[PDB]
Amino acid sequence: RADEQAFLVALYKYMKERKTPIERIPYLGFKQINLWTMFQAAQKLGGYETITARRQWKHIYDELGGNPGSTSAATCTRRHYERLILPYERFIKGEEDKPLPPIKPRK
DNA sequence: TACAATATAACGTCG
């Protein structure tokens, strides 16, 4: 929890210095942004790499919770994640550990 | 004003 929040406050400074602050990223599919949660959800559903190979965000919506009437709630989150932690998991996957391999065709 | 997010509808794929 605390280190994801610390590294997303560091991203918040860097992304505000890139004309793309969290001040223009108001919500998460159902609830508030809560980055650390959609991150650990994506890391259970196979990182952003299994997500891109399978459109597994519908399953991230499963780890997030239920929201009546949605069929692409977490799908919108994909477009947030690709600017809100896809540029920062680069330190996790380049200078700590790579638990997400490039092998992912489909099923 | 314009931009971003969420919801709904349609299309495609799989069973």
Next chain:
DNA sequence: CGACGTTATATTGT
């Protein structure tokens, strides 16, 4: 042929 999943479009809110 039917059901499920994914993608695209539209509407609403900030």
